[model samples]
Target chain A: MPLHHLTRFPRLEFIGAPTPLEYLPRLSDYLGREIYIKRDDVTPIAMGGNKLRKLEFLVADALREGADTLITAGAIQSNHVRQTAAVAAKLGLHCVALLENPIGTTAENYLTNGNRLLLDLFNTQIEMCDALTDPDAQLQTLATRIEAQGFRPYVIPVGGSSALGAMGYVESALEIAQQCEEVVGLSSVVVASGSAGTHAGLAVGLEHLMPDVELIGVTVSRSVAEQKPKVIALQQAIAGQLALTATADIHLWDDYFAPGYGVPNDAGMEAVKLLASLEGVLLDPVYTGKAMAGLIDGISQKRFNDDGPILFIHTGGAPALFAYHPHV
Target chain B: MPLHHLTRFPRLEFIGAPTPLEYLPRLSDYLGREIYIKRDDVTPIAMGGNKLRKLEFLVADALREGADTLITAGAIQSNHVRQTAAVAAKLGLHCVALLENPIGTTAENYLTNGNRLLLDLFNTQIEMCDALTDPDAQLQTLATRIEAQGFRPYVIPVGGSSALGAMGYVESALEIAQQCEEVVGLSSVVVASGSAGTHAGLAVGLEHLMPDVELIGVTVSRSVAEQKPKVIALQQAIAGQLALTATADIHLWDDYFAPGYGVPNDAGMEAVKLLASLEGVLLDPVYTGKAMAGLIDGISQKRFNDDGPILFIHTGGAPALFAYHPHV
Candidate 1:
């Protein structure tokens, strides 16, 4: 399929073209294996993250569909919800966030910094739901109430994982293939997998663009069996939208997940410290830390030859680090 | 002087080339003037600010002079002090910060959230001093104690405003000239002047390379009469180091520093909101906000014709905004 056909989809050109593919000489020397980092953390937005790429398509769709209000669901410290509110504000649309966490009184609990502050800045209306409650149903009920008030409300699923949003990461994978050849001769791609949109997109993207590159997803939550099918389904949906016949062979590892989502793991904490010490690079516990732990584990297991290079996709969650106290 | 000769002085190559010279379309359209923002905020450092560029030369001088410990002074939530600590850590050197206006009962203060966290991560020793009571004696006592130890300590003046440190801004003026043809064509430059290093450096730089450019320093703290001599002295010192027979002519403005340093002025508040609402850009109350206010005041006072482009140097302090609470 031609690239122009993809342009039929709506997208706002907020993020800069092609974030830098930085060489990790220190990490490479430390591990005795070639390592490079793709810095998507610096994506320009209201406190940038990997979700902005996904939201470019998702938000554009919301606006094009004549959405006066955008409703989305996420965890309390979700980067997606933060980016959604920012994007909504930029587009002059009202935003509602359904937070899947019990509301606490302490300022330190949810009101002080990070996504909470950003959400407040954007004037996003937030509804708190208990962890045991069905957040999606609550969001749907809120959307119904909003629609009754003569407002066109558009709903975005958690992590913006719809077929439309997955296109962002698909395009990003192609960008990586073009830029990484000269830097380190890219071999494998490692990233954090939660909602599976980015994982599925990259899997599909590599299948079409660079067949030799392996896609490795490190889960911050969910087991391998639980996430694999969801990723595959999303990939197939995205391919179907593009009218492409090719199917991606999805791959993920759940060994790095410790405790549960938003809980810091031992290996994750060590990975955070290692990256900071070696390269002056900062990684949060929730996302990049787990991914880094997986990368370190892979190297220790001799998964790849020392001659081959590895690329770690820093799907940013640095803000999430501020909420937790450092144990290591 | 040729570009190669510029490298003879002490310096380190850490900053990225030519940060985005973004045309503020919405702001320009609203103001009926061609406005462009120089995004030095994106400079690759821990919570990047314009101070990193100054530190590149200052830290290089310390390394060359064989100093083991770097000491600097700043107000509470000083971006310069934070960057200094980070650079020292990156070079495997010890850092001691003499911070004024001690607040908070806990180890973490308002500064702890933004740059202070990074400072602590770098293992910098922070000494809280009441400079209002005895400014000279406090700094002298700290210096004496450091000298008593085996480590050689190099003191960076407040805001890194020494001759060598000012060269960073001097180099940046040249970088801006190369990247922006309009800035060179218009012969005008605008920047926020706080501790005078950046203002002095730009003044000297413009005098050497872009002689036609009129460098305007908008005071964020000191008055015009008080700041002029300090800037001129620093500029002369830098010129002496470069072995160039030239003197900097600086134009100073004191219209924006009405409420004193680190205090929010009405115009400054408006400028902060304007940038955030119009362009999705963040500016702190202390530095960029006041500078932008002065720029707008200049336009209103008919300082320049609206036809020619105005280059506003965004000396970054967005992280400082996180320290301040939102006005209700």
Candidate 2:
């Protein structure tokens, strides 16, 4: 089935135009490859990120279902929650966020800056809990509590990673497929994979649209053993949603996300600096930075076998940079 | 003279497409007047702002002159300097930013976070000085020092607000002129007036393209008594640059920029919150927030005297919001 056939699903026009696909002249020369960036970072929403693409579909359904409130969860610096809250505000819907501190983060700025501040401005009802706590239950409980207050609630899972939410990236994959035609010898896309929706959607959409182009997921959280299966499951679920027969092959890298998720590693910092100084592109510490670190290492180690232009999907989380200010 | 006739000047295509012109349904209903927004904040560059437009032309000139280094000056949290540094990095030119504390700012994050952090990541040469000192002389001194080190230097003035730098906003004015046609009865544009280039360019461009569309500059730094003359002078200079006749009328408001520049005031904070919660838009503490505050006040006080839609030029500086985390 053609991806556009899913026009039956309602979607909001959050991204007004296609995010920029810019060539990195200096970074490309430095890395010895023709490197391009799919600037999902600069999407036209509250600060912009990959989550807005997902939220466009998720929030549309929420509205269609007559939801007056949106409930979701992620780490304290979660770009998804920030975007979710912003979208809710835009639509005059109440927002409840289930937030957890990433494992062992004692960072001062991390506690209450960046995306957290934006959430406050957007008037999101924040529910804080330990990283060990079950976020799913907490989200449902929050929804029920809000329901008692006579507000209709719509629950969006962590990272908006549900099959429906993943549909947004299916749209993005179509966008990329069209965009790749403009550049010569574009062979692959590299992106940070956390909640897996972005990866899953791209997997299903690109499988049909541009099967020759490789998709590499640099896991910002979870091991290859844990993350790959989850990604595959979601991809299959998305394929099923689209009435497609089979799913795309998944390539997951676990090496970059060292010392757990949301923690800035040395390689990630280096990657952040490299892209910032070389290409003037800002990648966040938690997600895109680590993903970029993986890409840089992949290039240095000659991991991507194809000699073609690689697209780094910049899933924008620049707000997190403020949280990691001391380290930066 | 037609503004597009200035195509002889070197300009880079930093803003590939026109920035979005979005209608604010909820905000307009709340404010009792129709409101539109020009999303200059989402310009596809390093974090994006009104600066990239100016830098496109400014940097193009820098390259044309065979300069190897770019030198500029601004407040410590200056969006212009941050963007200037980013552009320099992208073009492989050395960048030196002459920065100073914005008057008695002992705030924690103000010293080393937000824009300052990004400057570090972009590998900008940071030259700290007292706000009371002469900035123009300091910029020249830095340029001379760098030139002595066998590097050609291009000095961009504070806020990139020179006659040439203001050309970017003239281009923007042309954009808004075209955009306003799509939007019915856009009577005026409200924007932060810091360095005056943005205001001057808009004044000239809008005067030529849409004479009835009023241009309002909400002073973020100087008082109207101080800012009006500067804006008018630059507008006339820009008109001369394009070989046009008399400049446009300058409307400067000093009411909102209270407690001085780079400091967050109560009204600005409220405006920031209102826009964020109502329209899912983020305005910076130092610039757009205050400008929006003035616009909000202008609407509430019935000062604009217009029955038509008013456009707010969002001159992008969301990075400063993180430094304001505590206040927020």
Candidate 3:
């Protein structure tokens, strides 16, 4: 329960500590049980997102390495890319992004909207990749090439998914435990499952902080079968680095992501509308919307019938929502 | 000096307090003076903007009056309209907006994007007005119609610039004074001169708190000849409400708003680019961009010849940036 050792690793104090554990009163009444929201959305950097948690450590690592440039990879609308570029811009470090997207992903509105707009605004050198190619490998090669070009480049894996990056969530679990101290009886927590860093990080952290608390990872891309082990790997890696042997079970709902990434679906579109109308909080269709849909379905099926409240993490990507307006 | 009285009025506890008064090192280095930013831009509501400050009092006043419907008016991509609708949605009240736009203002991308997208997403009822027509007259007639429909309606003036709403920034001035205690020698403060609520409020607050500090209003739409008197009137009105009689000299820059409101100009575009490239902070082209352009132009002119620092109020609306992507 003592989580003070989280400061052992180098971290840039980038996050606004202890984001609100807000009670969704209207949302709770509309649904069955008490539904709470963990507002990681309001994280106070580059319009904020869950990525700032990991970037706190990742950016620190890049700085400590005496690097002059930071390199990361993601899809064009990747929140990670935007936040990374933002920090790099703020710090006056050159940033590069390797972007890849699935076929038929382009909407004219999307060509220069949402995260891409921020990317351009941030002056990030973006290299579009083959949609099916290995971006990580490309990132490694680019870093070496940049080093040869006499510019020190630090490469961050997609989503900042390294062990140290996941430590950010380890700290978050402790924050949550402290916040929920007065509120007795908690059931499960839900979040969007993307590259799995946040899910994996939370899994490892909650294993120690709230072992009995179920962690639901709603798939935004991959299926449960495909995503679970990857999450477990990140969880195990983080646990190893933290010098702890604990892990939370990953519960994933693969049903919400039908119709694919960046593409709007009926349930997700409804979920997006529901949260905006109900809470004044907006979610991007690619990530949080699908996860929210999963939560809504859970409510309908009495999955949250437990006495304790259900916590949903709002991993902010509302800027990306602008990209889907044409589809809407 | 006692600010507890400021909270006596009905208000919503809705702001991210003491928003980062961040030092812009890169920008300061480039501009040749110590430059700091008071980040009201990251106000933590509806993807963050400056309107939320005024709305806290405005919405509370609406709720206190037992009003069930909220009506406000704004431009084609109004951040005010977006935020007003956001709170209305959160409070489970119906919202109606009267939107006006200049001729040839609609970009296909902007029509389905930016603040407009949020307007549609939030389920706000929309009434379009002639660009030159008096929107206030429209707002009043609409309010009467809605009242006849058996719902109490609360009408908010554009930008929430009423005397009650301007009190938000009076609270902000106190926040700035508290933030600047350890630091000294603040020469002047700069903010976008839009509807003038913010400038008026800050003027009153600083007059009492830091009277020697000159407050510069960077005109985003109107010239000094047009805006100064209106701002003074509001400042006087608010001072009367607070039972204080104090006046601060208002300095206005009419140069940056050339080509008028919502129309892109080179200096504003350059200012947006400069901030993003240097500080990694985004500024919307309409308001903050023009205000920032004024700041940059001032630096060139040695406007802050004093050794003291200059603080720029970042009044959000980066969401409005996407609407101007084509211009960028």
Candidate 4:
């Protein structure tokens, strides 16, 4: 209950509390397993996402380090970039996000909808880059220019995966432990592993708190071979950050994220539709939809038949769903 | 905290609890008044909006009456229609929404974004109608046709404004009252007066619970001439439905919605930008933006100088901001 020293850093409270632990009864019945969800998409800041949890700590650190401007980068409709822009605006600081086109060409719809619109609303300096541009390199160039202009710049890595940011989910693990105290046999938490912070933070959280709950990462950007090392490094790093011992018990499924990141696919689309129709909850194609597809597919394969209630982290990117041309 | 015999109805629970009463310190400083917001937009289902509150009771009643299909009507990008579609789908009921284009001319953007996209995901049968078409007439026709198909059809008036549905906000009023208790001298509550249900329901709740809190409805669709009577009627009807003696003291504002419904205008855009930049909250160009513009204008005019704190009800329509032409 003492926060395990993870509360040493300051966190701005933008997250809508407890983020609604909801039962997916229809989906569960359809899947023949107990399915529940942590509605991180219900984060409720700048249209909400899992990134805001990271932002809470990261933004605080930015402020503490005398930052007047924050720099981050992501895909054109990145929930991270949108929320980062919002947090900066809310805190009366300047923000610049390097947005990369998810596809090869600059489709008109991609420029106008979802987080792109929000980036404009928040008055963020959107340094538009090509799809293949190294976002970190671009961010470094932008941050230096911003700092040269005499504004203090704090740069966050892609997906906000730094150890400090991962504290958000470690803290979240505490929230989950308290909320699920009475539910017997709560076994696993499924999350979309992109930049690996949420997955790693959650892995650390589950290791220290829930004990029984497994952290399953549905890779949205990388294969298990690639993402696991990154996820494990962060898990160990988060444990180091929290001053605790942690085992890198990482379980990631890579098959769901075929056809690359930000490029929508059939399975993710079906998962989004299924969640909407059955549970009245919407999932973004980039992350939670694919993560959910993994869940549904795994359930169908009897991978979770022996487990208890499985929590799929709805990492809060429903607003980005607007960016796409429907059916394209 | 008992529901005074109003607990006799079945209701579905999709509401995100408490919905976050966030303090807008920077906005307060900018406006020279203590300002705050009640985030009904943070409601977790189907990308969220204030309509989910009304839908809880309305959907419950539909289910109560053995209805298998629901019919509603709204603007082409109507948050009400989108949320209605979601609630129906969640409850295993079929949904049909007659969406009228707010602007007479066809625009590609209007057809693809926001609530329009969600309607497809939820499998809602969308009947595209002209803006001038009477929604009530259309709903009647649709309901009759669906009923003729041997399905029990239920119709919710646009914005879920019926007395049965208004109970959602009567319930929400209690939530707000409890949440805002510590903040003394709460004088006014501002709301978007598009459908009349939220404005009227809040009026009824405040009249019974917190008599001093003024219910200010900033009309987004109707002029004061058109909206006041409807709001008053709903207020009176709500009191009558609850068997409570209540005075209908409706304060309606028509100044903000000049360029007409769903037509994005400068003042609303300014309000949207200001709220985003200052409070990390986004407002839909259609409803809350106009209502917020009214609030901002009122504050600039010293409307709340003597009041303790002004509570702006964010009636959760941020998704609709996507449908308009960027920078419109």
Provide all candidates' interface root-mean-square deviations: 3.0, 0.7, 1.0, 1.2
Q: Candidate 4's chain A scores what TM-score?
A: 0.96
Candidate 4 lDDT score at position B320 = 77
- Per-candidate DockQ vs. reference: 0.28, 0.87, 0.79, 0.75
Q: lDDT values of the candidates?
A: 0.76, 0.88, 0.84, 0.83
Best by lDDT: 2
**Worst ten-residue run, lDDT, model 3 chain B?**
B102-111
Poorly placed runs, candidate 3 (over 4 Å): A183-185, A304-307, B2-4, B305-307
- Kindly report the root-mean-square deviation of model 1 from the true structure over all alpha carbons: 4.0
Tens digits of per-residue lDDT for model 3 on A157-192? Answer: 888888788887887888888888877556889999
- Residue A164 miss distance in model 3 (angstroms): 1.0
The deviation in Å at residue B256 for candidate 3 is 0.8
A1-328 in candidate 2: lDDT tens per residue?
Answer: 4775568788999997888888999999999999999889898989999999999899999999999999999888889999999999999999999888876667778888889889999999998877626767888888888899999999999999999999989988878878777555678889898889998888888888888888899998889999998898899888777778555579998999988888889999889899999988898879998999999999888788587889899889998889877752
For residues B127-246, write the lDDT of model 2, one tens digit per residue.
888762676788888899999999999999998888898999988987888777778777888999988999898888888888888888999988888888888889888889888775
Q: What's the true lDDT of residue A270 in model 2? A: 89
* Backbone N/Cα/C clashes per model: 0, 0, 0, 2
lDDT (10s digit) by residue, model 1, range B155-205: 888888887788888888787777776443564668999788898878877
| Models sorted by lDDT, best on top | 2, 3, 4, 1
lDDT tens per residue, model 1, A210-317 = 878778898888899998888888988888888775555677889898777777788998888777655656688778898899999988996643447888998777
Candidate 4 lDDT score relative to the true structure: 0.83
Sorted on TM-score, best first, the list reads 2, 3, 4, 1
**lDDT comparing candidate 3 with the true structure:** 0.84
Candidate number with the higher TM-score (3 or 4): 3
| Model 4 chain A lDDT-worst window of ten | A102-111
TM-score of 3: 0.97
